[PDB]
Structure formats: C-alpha cells, structure tokens
Design a protein around this ligand. Sequence first.
Ligand SMILES: CC(C)CCC[C@@H](C)[C@H]1CC[C@H]2[C@@H]3CC=C4C[C@@H](OC(=O)CCC(=O)O)CC[C@]4(C)[C@H]3CC[C@]12C
Ligand SMILES: CC(C)CCC[C@@H](C)[C@H]1CC[C@H]2[C@@H]3CC=C4C[C@@H](OC(=O)CCC(=O)O)CC[C@]4(C)[C@H]3CC[C@]12C
Lengths: 552, 552
Amino acid sequence: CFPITLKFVDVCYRVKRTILSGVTGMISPGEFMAVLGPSGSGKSTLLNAVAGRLHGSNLTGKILINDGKITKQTLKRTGFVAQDDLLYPHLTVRETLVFVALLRLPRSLTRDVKLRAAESVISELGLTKCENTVVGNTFIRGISGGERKRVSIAHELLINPSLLVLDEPTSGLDATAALRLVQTLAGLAHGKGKTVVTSIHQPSSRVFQMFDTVLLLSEGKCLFVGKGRDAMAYFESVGFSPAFPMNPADFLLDLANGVCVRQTLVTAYDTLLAPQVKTCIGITTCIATWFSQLCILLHRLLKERRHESFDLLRIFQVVAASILCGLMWWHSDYRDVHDRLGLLFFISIFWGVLPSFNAVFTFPQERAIFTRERASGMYTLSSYFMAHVLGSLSMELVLPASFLTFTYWMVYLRPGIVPFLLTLSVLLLYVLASQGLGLALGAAIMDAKKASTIVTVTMLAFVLTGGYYVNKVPSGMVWMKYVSTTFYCYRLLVAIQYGSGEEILRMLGCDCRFVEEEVIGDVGMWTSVGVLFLMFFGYRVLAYLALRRIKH
Amino acid sequence: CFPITLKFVDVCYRVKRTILSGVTGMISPGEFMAVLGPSGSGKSTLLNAVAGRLHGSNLTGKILINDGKITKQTLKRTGFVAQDDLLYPHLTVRETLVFVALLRLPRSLTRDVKLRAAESVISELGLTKCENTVVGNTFIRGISGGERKRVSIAHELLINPSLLVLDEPTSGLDATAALRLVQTLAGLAHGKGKTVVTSIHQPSSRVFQMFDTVLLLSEGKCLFVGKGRDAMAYFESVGFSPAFPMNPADFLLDLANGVCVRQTLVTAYDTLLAPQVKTCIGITTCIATWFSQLCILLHRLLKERRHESFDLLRIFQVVAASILCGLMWWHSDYRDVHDRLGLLFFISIFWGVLPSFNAVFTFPQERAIFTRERASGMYTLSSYFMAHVLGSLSMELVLPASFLTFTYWMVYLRPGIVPFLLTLSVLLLYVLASQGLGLALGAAIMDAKKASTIVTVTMLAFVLTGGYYVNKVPSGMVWMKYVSTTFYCYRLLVAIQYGSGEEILRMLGCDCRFVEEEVIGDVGMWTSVGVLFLMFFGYRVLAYLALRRIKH
Ligand SMILES: CC(C)CCC[C@@H](C)[C@H]1CC[C@H]2[C@@H]3CC=C4C[C@@H](OC(=O)CCC(=O)O)CC[C@]4(C)[C@H]3CC[C@]12C
Ligand SMILES: CC(C)CCC[C@@H](C)[C@H]1CC[C@H]2[C@@H]3CC=C4C[C@@H](OC(=O)CCC(=O)O)CC[C@]4(C)[C@H]3CC[C@]12C
C-alpha cells in the first residue's frame, strides 16, 4: 500500500492575466476532495498543475507529492481523466480495456496477469453488464454517456494509481448517472485508500452531500477549504446566509460570482483559515517490445481499418466501376490500339484518385487519440506509424484485386497466367504508391478539408501529364510527367499488354507512327518499377517526418 | 388586449406505452408555469399537446384555449419555441429578425411597420448590443448560446402571441445566462400579461424562486399543481421532508424518480388537490404575394449561397484547373485534332462533375429549417424551391465564366467574338443542366453521403459513354450516350470549334476517317441544344416532385 499525501503551497499561474494566485491546501490519503468554482475561475488549471501536466515559468509555487517534489516516478501512480473521452468506436468494452491493459502494464507480467487486471477494473467500475457492447461515438451506436466515462476512468485504473485526478466527470450526464458516478469515486477513496481529486461543474443537492472536503475558487483566490458539511457554518460566521432554500453548492457559487462579495471573503479567509492551513503543512529487449507494441497496435486497429476500407458505399463504388468498365470494353479487340489504351488509362486514373483521396483522412482523424496516448507512454509513434502503414497495406488491396479479377477476362485483355499476374502486380504497387501521397499530404496538413483540395489539384496535374490526354506537351512542361505516379503505372500496363510494339505493328502492318509513340514511349519496364518503389517508401518517409514535426 | 386562459382536462397520450394519463390543470393569463419532471416523464409531450402540435387518435382529453376547442385562429396567438435553434449562420442578428418580420407579419402593413416590429423585440429581449454580430453555428463564430436562444424566442414574439410555450430553453446554458433568460420570461408574463408555459430540466436554487406555478409529472401522472412557494409545504402534510439542505427542485424530482414513493403520492394528490382543480374549471393578390415571398427568400439566402459558391477552397480548385489546362494546351494548334478534342472533353468532365457534386448537399442540409418554417406559414415550398433554383442560377455561373475567359486566348481556341460567346453559352448551359442532376438526386435521397455516391456512379457512366474514351461501343450500350449530359456538351463544343469538318479536312488533306467520326458525329447542333434545355427544366421538375414526397 503506497498512499499519497498531496500539499500545494501558494500555487500561482500567469499566462501571456492571472488565473491562479495564492492557492494553498492539502489533500490527504483517503479523502474525496471536490474543487468548486464558476466557469473561468481556474478550476481546470489547478487540476493540471496538480496532476503534473503544467510546469515551467508560467507556474509559481511548490506542489509536493508526499513531502517531495514531482519526479517522474510519482507520475506512474498519478492518473488524470481528462474532460473528453477519446475511444475507438468499433471495439467492445472488453476489447477496449484489454488492449489498454497489454499496452500500459509492464512486460514483466504474463498475458494472464495483464488480462485479469483488465477484468478486475470492469467489475470495480460496474461495466460487467455492457462488456460485450460496442463503444460507438454517435453513428456506431453503443454504450451510454455514463458508461463512456467509466471506460475512460478504467484506462487510468489499470496502472493502479494512488492519486486519481478527474476533470469534470459529471458533465453531460443525468442526475442519476452523475450520482452513481460520484458514488463509485467515493467508493474508491474510502475503501481502496486512494486520493481522488475532482472538479464538479454544478453539483445537485445530494451529490454535494458526498464530498469529504471542498475547495472553492472565486476567480483564482481560494475562498474556502475544509469539510463539505462545515461549509455554510463558516459563512454564517462572516455573515452570509441564504435567504431562501438553496442547494449548498448553489449558495457557494453565488458567493464566488458577485451575485450575493468577493473581496470581503478573501480577507475573511486569509485571516481565519489560511493561517492554520500552514500548520498541518539489448537486441532482444529493445526490439522485442517494439514488435509486441506493433503486434497489439495492429490487432487493435484492424476493426478501425475495416469500416474505412470495406464501407458499403465504397464497395458499391468499385462494383459499379467494374461493371461499367466491363461493359464498355466488353470482349474488346486488341487491334483497336486506341481504345485498349483508354481502358488502361482509366484503370490508372481510377486507382490513383481513389486510394489517395481516402488516405488523406487517416492521420487528421486520429490526432487527438494519438496525442493523449503517446504522452501516456503506451507507444512511441514509430510503432504507431508502422501499424498504420502495415494495417492499410493489407486492407486496401482487396478491392483493386477484385476489380481486376472481374474485368480482365470479360474485357479480353492479354490471355495467360503471367500477363494476368503482372497486370495485378503493377496495379497493386500503384495503389500503394499513390496511397502514400495521401498519407504524406494528410500528415503535413493536419486538416482534412484543406488537404483533400491539394490532393485533388495534385492528382489532376498527374492525370493531365500521365501520357494519354495531351501528346504534344509544350517544351517547358515535359518534366512534369516524371514526377507523376500515373505516368509510371500507365507505361507499365501498356508494356505488359503490348510489349515493345512488335506483334501489333505486324498485325496492323504499319512497319502510322501512332503505334510507335504510344506503345513504346520513354521509360523502360525497370525504370518504371523502381520509381514506383521509390514513391512507395519515399512518400511514407515524408509522412513520418511530417508527424514528428507536429509534436503530435 | 387578448389574453388566453388555458385549461387541459385529463389529457392522455398513448403511442404504439402510456406517456400521459390523467394530466389535468389550468394556466391563467399572467402566470409563468414551469413543468418539472424526470427525463422521459412526458414533459415534452405535454407541451406539444398544449401548443397544438399533437392531435389525433393517440391523444385523449379536452384541451381548451379560453373555454373553447383549439381552432386555427388561436394558433396565430400561440407560439412554440422548440428545443433546437435553427438559424442561418451568415445573417446578422438584425438581418435574421427583419427577414422573419417581413415573412411572418401580414401584408396589410407597410415596410416600416414590419421593420419597427422587428426592432422592438430586439430591445425587449435584450439583443441590442449584439444586433450587428453574425449568428454563426460552430465555424462562422458568432453570438453566444444564451443569445442564440433569444433569437429563437424573438421569432415567436414577432407575431405578438398570447400563449408562449417554450420547450427546455435553459438547456446548455450557464447558471448566469439561464437565470437572466428566466428573468425575461418572467418579465413578459408579469408586465405584458402573457401566458408563458415552459419546462425546465434541472432548475437551480433561485431559478425555482421565479416560478409562479409548478406542474410536476412523475412518469405521466401529475404529482403536484399549484404555487411554487407552496410546493414543499404540501409534501410535509403527507410526510415527505428533506433530510438535508436541498434545492426544492431537486427534492421534487427525487420524489418523482423513486429515490425517496410514486404510488403513495398519486393517491395523495388524487384525493386532496385533484378534486378541487375541477372547480375552477385574384391575379394581383395570389401572384404578388408569391413574388414578394420569392423576393425576400432570394435576398435572404444570398449570403448562404455565397460561401457555398465562393468558398476559398473552391476558387483555388478552379484557379488550379485553369492554369493546368492553360499550360498543357498552351498556344495549341488546331490541326492537332486529337489533342484539341481532349481539351474540349476535359472541359466537359470538369464542369459536369464539379457542379453536380456540389449541388447534392443543398437540400439535405436545409431540411430541418424548411420543415420548421413551412409548417409555421411563412412560405409554401414553391417560393422556397424557386429561390434555390434562381439563387444558384446566378452564383454558379461566375467560376465557369472565369475559367473560360482565362483559358480561351492562352489555349488558342477558335478566334473571334462569335466563337467565344457560343463556347461560353454552351458551357453555362451545361453547368446548369448538370447542376440539376445533383439537385434531383439530393432531394430524392435526403442523405448527403448516400447521394454523393450515386452522383459519382452516374457521372462515371456519363463520362465513359460521353464520346471520347471508347469509339467502338458494343451494340447493347450505344443507347446510354443519349441520356448522358456530357455527350451533348462535348458534341456542341466540337461543332463550334470545327464545324462540319470542312476546313479541317482541307488542311489535313484527308478528303483518314479519324476526322469524319470524331468531329461530325451523330446529333445536330439543335438537337444537342434542345436536350440540354430538357435536362435543365426536367431535372428541376424531378427535384420539386421529390420534395413534395418527403412531406418536408
Ligand atoms: C472515364 C475517364 C474519362 C476517366 C475520368 C475520371 C474518372 C475516373 C472520374 C470521374 C468522376 C470521378 C469521381 C468523382 C468524385 C470522387 C471524389 C471522391 O469520392 C467521394 O467523395 C466519395 C468517397 C467516400 O466518402 O466514400 C473520391 C474519388 C471520386 C469518387 C472520383 C473517382 C474518379 C471518377 C470516377
Ligand atoms: C485529365 C482527364 C483524364 C480528366 C480526368 C478527370 C478529371 C477532370 C478529374 C481528376 C480528379 C477529379 C477531382 C477529384 C475529386 C473531386 C470530388 C469533388 O471534390 C471535392 O470533394 C471538393 C468539393 C468541395 O467540397 O469543395 C468534386 C469533383 C472533384 C474535385 C474532381 C473533379 C474532376 C477531376 C479533376
């Protein structure tokens, strides 16, 4: 049993405005202190300066975890439940808390110890009768808002903390769900010997009955500390009583808001209670934990990258483009050299626009969950990036491989096993090379509407210079095809279906320079392959360096 | 002065579950009655059955506006402020309330009477110090959440009602903004002689002090009616007192929730208070108001259809496609008959995909505001549809007319005034004909993600059968080009730049059937024009019949 006594002595916090000034108190092992105050009084700045997420020059004052300063050994026993709940919406409640248990608990334990620690906090917080329910956010409909907060508390109870610092847990709940939530926070402060500190926004009449001690901030100058049942007995002494039946938490916020008065209760506290508050004061251990962090992060996000890959409005978009492409070029003749190349350029526009546009929403949408979880240990951005690289290498190759299996034998392309699997290999390498353009642009620009416009303009300049629409490019724009991804896929597709124009010039008898300039071209088959590999790796190295630059 | 005495006698409401059963009471002229209860108790069903938005077979009971039944003459003096605020986010507070004043007040008045009635409710509700601030929703940042509710109350105060029925106005506010809001609802019930009925979710200690009468529902059986200051004096008689200092609104909801008990207070009310509650119980007048409803609705939504037309991420998407199209075909030669026709088919793909995709979000996003305002009189869906037709005829023609003015003289298209204005006329007629495909699809499918997929699949089958990519269409798919919008714009552009292939076959000397099949084609210039007009009108008649079918 390691309990924490906590004492902050005269904490100040300016920002460039004074938010906190002279806040002093103590929090004991085994008490449930609630921090009351109006909005903009400095409640949430006091919780961040106590949990340890704020230190520097803007802060001023001694914050003492068990008579000593805050070192990083204490932060493993200190939890902070922030105001917003960032959970993946397709995992169940048991799946959410088991993946967090493997990632957060140390690797000295077995996989059965770290699995029984995740089904103990399910029974502690009362999540047993929803443990197979999907979490959901607003569209993947799941657990309630009062059980979404209990999952976010269970993230911080898996490491068994001694000081649990919550930041407005009862905001947005009922009067019943917000009473039962405080009934459990009072449970694991009187039975577990913990030290719970919270900040309630507007307590009801019997939520306020459950507080051991109350700290009341006016606009950053600490009107009252002490017990909750002795709150209005102190204000009767200075001469402030309610004139009608009030909730005692309503009467306190009306003193801190100027409706009853602020300066008269600063000088009353500073001479009567603020005096005596001072009186009680390797290559198999560096590598194996990366490949286990990767293996859990890849198995966790399989369900996330399954509804953003096999969306039923994206399967329909590829089923429709297979039937249309399969009907317009149905039983096509390879001696029509102009329509066979417009088929192979439709495959290059469709499978460069569709992967690069969908990949640009991947990193903006997970910036908040990655920031909260990387700062909490739990991974190191290179096992997070390499689980998004590998997790979308596997899922994004099922729809282009089913487009081509359908529309290769109906369209009468080049018959055989080796012409089929060379066309399939070039199409899958082009989907992965163009997907990384969307990853590198969505990570450099962490907005998703500002980056869907730059990947639209880039894919339009890639298609216009890709080899088919314009044949007489002006002399100052012939360089732009060499940076184009579409130019190297389309030159490879024509080289598989036609070769070096030898059989087609015999059958056409044109050996009329139409088929010498469109089927042979400029780049070889190995220069075209080795630039689609340089754009595979190179557009994912640029997406990693973009994500280092954010700080998150 | 026309005041309303309101008495509901034994209102029941089943749904196929009993929501209301035996609710009886009276509301007097000049009292501010608040309706209390837990969530799911039938508060919001009682307000809709009293304002008049619920009547039929599911309802049972006599609802009497001033000793008589509810006729539609009384509903002009009855206002209902619903729970969610549906305001256009680019109008200022004065602009919002003046357009509502012209549309709601009768046409007997002048434009200065209906303008001074809109600056009287600004001063009444205390909106004078934000009357030039933009409203905004979350992105167009504007007035606060406590002033967004005061605009929604001012919509219903413009018709000068006698019974104002609000539905949870203080939800999502502060403790200060939700006290000042009740201080004005108590202002226009004690000074104006109105009859305000509201339903507060969780009142604070001094919000409850401002209620004249209180109606308390348990789960639909009316625990208490009477004064608010005599609420707990009645429950002391049956033997229910708080054991600790409570907010008196908290003690009442704990009686109605089973935490203190429900059936013991139904039989206490039914024999002590529910007895004695029975004891007090043309062609220039049909046309001119349409063309004035159209003229206000078109001037109101000019600012709405200015940020969805001149979005700065859409100006950049057309500026980039002008420079790319202007550089790849820079000083192009018209004897390159294959590259001149790929320029004229990129203009047909770009200006059919871009208007039809943006038009599909127009009607889904305004379904909630149109439903609330059409049911409230104020317009009739044919002056609303013809203000969206005409309001986007004007704004959507500025970006295609600036694309073409830039890239006609750099690209060296056909020189002259008559070749320029025939190419501009065909391009503007094609933008309006393809925009109506997005309007007809977004109105038949009132989702915006399910309809952006069907307008993607349709525009892909329009571009493949459009005439350039495939020449030898199989015999069962040649009909599909005649329903294509892209086929008729592209056949008109080639007919303006080349004519009936006479000068180009002389200069090429091929009179080699390449230029006989791609520049002359199938349809004439008048059949192509008169089908783009049939798709202009016909895709907007189908969008009107889709909007009748919704009921909204
Ligand atoms: C037939 C020849 C001339 C090729 C012409 C280009 C086509 C391949 C274009 C025409 C319309 C394009 C579509 C128009 C709109 C979009 C934007 C974007 O689609 C969405 O917004 C839906 C994505 C989602 O949210 O699921 C992704 C690409 C897509 C489907 C485009 C894919 C490529 C398409 C089919
Ligand atoms: C060069 C030849 C082969 C023509 C090929 C078709 C092009 C005209 C395509 C290629 C990519 C397409 C764009 C890809 C994505 C979209 C979806 C959609 O764009 C958006 O999602 C942004 C709209 C907005 O929200 O402002 C509207 C059409 C647009 C810009 C497409 C317009 C038509 C483009 C430029």
